[PDB]
Symmetry: C6
Subunit: 274 residues, 6 copies
């Protein structure tokens, strides 16, 4: 059955970004931690955020981390589950579970997997009829934001289109440090220079690189058995066995989407003359 | 279940237009408040109106306000409800509820979401058999009036194709006043200049702008905690993050449709020679 | 349920045409009123006629009027009913009702709305197995006569393709008189000059014009209250709000269809040499 | 329910052709009337014939007449029945009825109405498993022989593709004599010259002409009432109200099909040198 | 129900070919009559063969004859049965019947009539799980071998793609002798010259010719009654009504397929140098 | 029912390759045989590999052999089983059987046969919810790797895309030795030169060649009866009866895919400067 627990992931786990972290805080923590000014001002707290960006960059990581920050249960519904709903009334049960688990951060991973459909409109019906007062917060993830119908992007539903970009160099070394730890590693590992060589490898690609280096370590030690730490040569040579999943054209079209939403923000000099 | 109550919205809440207000009064109030001349003249009161225009302009606001004016119950059926009936005889139950709640203003929000279909034809069957004597009044809203089948525009059904344009400058400041109010705001808010710099922002866009200014106020005050009114700088720095949802081409083709229906009205000099 | 009653409409109500009146008389009245020569001659009376023409010209009016002439019940099955049968065995019950109500003029309004289909084939099965002896007479209407499958136009079924053109000028003023009557109207209404200005407005358009004039009268009187006759200015200023529903291209292609059926009739000089 | 009776139609009714009469005789009468030589020779009697030709030429007439000649029950299944089978296991019941009614001439009118389908393959299954010994003979009719799948034209099924052409001049006058008879007619009716002026009118068209002339007779007599025989002028003028249903292009493509099946027969000089 | 009996057809009935006969013996007889060497060698007997070639050439005749040679039951499943299973778990019952009837030669006539499908996949599932030890032998026939999914041509399924060409002149006279016999025929029938003048007539066409000659004999004798052997003039005057069903282009593309499978076999000079 | 047993195939059987042998060893044996370093290092063992390559190269052979090496049960689900799942909840039963049989090597043969579908999504759901701790290891096979949806290639699922190329010349003679063995063969058989002539024959093609040689031996011995060793002439001549199943274009595009995955691996000089 669905697991409803507080994720152990933390902001330190993912160093991919910092502005998105603060935006998520203001979006989620403030309505629940400080429910004082929202009633004072003409603010109706947003109950929906949609994450978009290249695949395997940490959208699930961001959702889990923000759930951890507020110590609110986290419920994840995978894409295959929505697809079996499509091929296969239980969306109401999912939402009632989330409600009874409040405060909660419901998560819809790759909700665009189906891409007006039975399950999607059922989700819309259940989301619109959800009391915004309750602590339930809904987050969706999709690496193909364009193909999602706009009926989910209307007010009272998922509003904020948050972009999760490819990690930067400092961010990349942060993700590497996060992944390698909890296992033996040489005290003279480059890490930073490891990040610099990484041009456009996503978090998934860095995890794959670390996995391959560990695998080479196991192979070497197992051969020696018939050595207590991951030597430098492992990462030194395994990087030949590394590939960039996301093509530069994909990043450029993601940036085209972002620049569209930015030129939408392009309106300027309005400054209330004094 | 469906909520059947008199909306608290009022004409003051929306200042987008005035002639539409008057024609809505003549359409709805007159048959119910003054059922004295309709039977005198060869007039069969209209019982259906279809709103069309760019999305997020106040069609729902108009319907709620006109329901409030007559103090008649208001029943809304969202697009997702029709779509789930399409995917999923409940239309009959909806109409019986409306009948038992008479006087009432049944509202079909974005009824073109389905776009000859099963549910739409059931709606037509229930509407044609509805006694015009009863006070029930049916209103439909659609942001894409062209794709709607003509079977709904026939006499005895939704006849009046009303147009809801973008709010004008004075209307825009009226909407800003109607929305911003009920929350702290600086006494020296320009508002009028705020409306003038808004070129083609719809009511939804103005609401988003106000919400963003309020959000910035909350963030600033929360930082100060670790201030009691929405400063001017909030609006000044939030407008740069204001985007016009409806494109100029969309308004141009809406005006093309309106000009088609107007040149249909273009017949002129007939003046009953005397 | 289906209404089985003698329509109160009369030939006086519709002046659109006169030849069709006599042709319908010979089609319907003669087999029932004078069943003396049909068995004498080698003629099997026709039990089906299909009306075609631009929409809103009075096809239903003609059917109701001819039913009134013979004082025979009239059963109407609207397009939404056929289409809900299509989406949703009741055709047999409809025909049994017609039989038990004999003499009757069953009417299939816009039977081409479905456009070989399940309901169409069931209707054909019930019509072929219907005893031509019984007084029941079947009439169909279709604004789109071409898309109708030929399976219904075979002998023993809907055979006579009657055309209902736009009302003539004198016929237009006849329709005006038929409509505005039963309500106050100024003794000095031109009517004839009103019809002359009407270039190609159908009966529905004239009804809309009269309704708009009555609306203006209602509004003016209600304003005056806060006058007992529809003044000339009402029609004078409502005509500018009159639009011709049927485009001249539609009338031209209708006339192309008629000229096709006429050139089929174009065989000439055969004159029985003697 | 299905009617199983010996048709009263006779060869004298239809003078459309003579060779097809003899071919049908040899195909049907011989296997049943004189079942002697078939066993002697290496002949397996054919149990299927498919009629093709322009519509309304007498395929049903031919089937009924041949059934009459052998005094064998005749069962007809209309196209709408097959279509309701398609949209709607009763084919087995139809075939068992035909078997129990043996000798019988089962008739499938416009069996190509559906045009590999459920009902058609069910018919194939029931036909292949039908004992050729039994007197049952199956005849199919289709005015669109090309669109019929070839699975029905294999040996052991409908073999003989019999063409039913447009009636000749003498045949046309024979058809007229068959039609106008049994009702009053002037002793000085052309008939022969009536046929000559008829260029390409099918049997259905000639029946329509006779029906229209009778209709004019009824109209004239009933007008005189407010004359005991169909005068010459009725046919003289009603022929202006006559049309040729089948276009010359349709006849030419039917003849293209026939000439294909004839050049298939084009093999010549083989004469067994002696 | 399915008939399971040893066919009475024999190799003498069909003289279309001889090498195919021998290879069929080696395929079927050897595993069952002489199960002595297969286990000695690394030979897993084939349990599937697919016949392909122009229609009406004797594929069913070949299957029946080979079943007769081994005196093993023969089960035939016609194409309509597969199609009705497709439209309509009976494949399992068919295979259980074949198993209980072992030794048997299951035959799937025109199994490509459906042309990955439900029934064909069920057939594959039942065939793969069939113990090759058992005497059951599966043969499929299809005159359109290209459109058949390759899933059936894998090892452990129908392997051998056997080709059945048009009968040769000597083969044609053999077929004529096999068919004409058992009925009176003149002692001076050339037969051989009849075969020579037959250019590309298939077995079905030769059977049609014989049937037509017999029919003419019946007609002549039946006329003479109102003679005891089939005269030469019957064949002479019936040959002119003989048509070659299979076009030259069809045989050419069949030979294209055969030449493809032969050039695949075209690998040559490999000869084990010694 | 599904068979759960340790395959008797061994690495000595298929000599098609050597590198994939060690790769599969490190993938499967190490996590179960020596589960000492996996928890020490930060590596989560992979629980899924997907085989791709030209058909009939031994993918099933590799899976069975690797299952044999660890002495773990082996469950195979064929393509027709998945397709009857698609046309026909039992995937869960399959996985429960695999779990209860742990350690096991579940095999999905030609899982791309279906080519987001119901069965594929159910398989993904069952695979994601499968505890990686358990010894169960999942292997998939597809000779059309491109058409497979990427939903199965994400981390935590079938991850390692292993390529099974055409056997090398030494490998080809190894396969010949593995196949021909267990049956009589001459002591003076080329084998090596036999392999050299084999340019691009896959394992299935070599099996076909051996089967044809055994067939010829069977035929010659059976003729001689009416010799106890497979003579050289059998292979000498049967090679003229052999064909290469895989076209050089297919291998070229397979190598195009391989070179794509290699250029993805093309990142080079990263060598940890020191
Ligand atoms: C917004 C890019 S979404 C995306 C991301 C990764 C992988 C695939 C996709 N979708 C597509 O490529 C579909 C094609 C038609 N694109 C291209 C494109 C560029 C800029 C703006 C919008 C579009 C769009 O709809
Ligand atoms: C009437 C515009 S309705 C509309 C409004 C907002 C967003 C989308 C739409 N529909 C479309 O764009 C479909 C395309 C095909 N249009 C364009 C157009 C211009 C003028 C008149 C009629 C049409 C029409 O059918
Ligand atoms: C017979 C016109 S019925 C009609 C009437 C009003 C509105 C629409 C329609 N149908 C169409 O326009 C379909 C198009 C393809 N037409 C044009 C036309 C001219 C003359 C003859 C036959 C055809 C026909 O099939
Ligand atoms: C054999 C004429 S069947 C026919 C008869 C009346 C009315 C309609 C039809 N069908 C068609 O017209 C379809 C078109 C594609 N034709 C034309 C044609 C000429 C000669 C030979 C074969 C074909 C054929 O398949
Ligand atoms: C192998 C001939 S199969 C056949 C036999 C009789 C009647 C019809 C058919 N199929 C077709 O005609 C379909 C078309 C597309 N062909 C032509 C052709 C020539 C050579 C090789 C392969 C093909 C093929 O797939
Ligand atoms: C990836 C080749 S899988 C394959 C193997 C054998 C037989 C058939 C197939 N599939 C195809 O041929 C589909 C066509 C469209 N190809 C060609 C191709 C070359 C290189 C890279 C990718 C593609 C691809 O998607």
């Amino acid at each position: 059955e669905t697991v409803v627990e507080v994720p152990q992931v933390t902001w330190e786990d993912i160093g991919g970004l910092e502005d998105v972290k603060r935006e998520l805080q203001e979006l989620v923590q403030y309505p629940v931690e400080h429910p004082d000014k929202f009633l004072k001002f003409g603010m109706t707290p947003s109950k929906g955020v949609l994450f978009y960006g290249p695949p395997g960059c940490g959208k699930t990581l961001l959702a889990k981390a923000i759930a951890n920050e507020c110590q609110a249960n986290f419920i994840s519904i995978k894409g295959p589950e929505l697809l079996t709903m499509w091929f296969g009334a239980n969306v109401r049960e999912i939402f009632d579970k989330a409600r009874q688990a409040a405060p909660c951060v419901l998560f819809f991973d790759e909700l665009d997997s189906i891409a007006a459909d039975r399950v999607i409109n059922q989700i819309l019906t259940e989301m619109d009829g959800m009391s915004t007062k309750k602590n339930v917060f809904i987050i969706g993830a999709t690496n193909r934001p364009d193909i999602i119908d706009p009926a989910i992007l209307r007010p009272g539903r998922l509003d904020q289109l948050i972009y999760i970009p490819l990690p930067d160099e400092k961010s990349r070394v942060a993700i590497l440090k996060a992944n390698l730890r909890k296992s033996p590693v040489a005290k003279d590992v480059d890490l930073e220079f490891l990040a610099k060589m990484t041009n456009g490898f996503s978090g998934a690609d860095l995890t794959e690189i670390c996995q391959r280096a560990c695998k080479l370590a196991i192979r070497e030690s197992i051969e020696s058995e018939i050595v207590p730490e991951i030597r430098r040569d492992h990462f030194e040579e395994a990087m030949r066995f590394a590939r960039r999943s996301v093509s530069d054209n994909d990043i450029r079209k993601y940036e085209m989407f972002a620049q569209t939403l930015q030129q939408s923000r392009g309106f300027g000099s309005f400054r209330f003359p004094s």
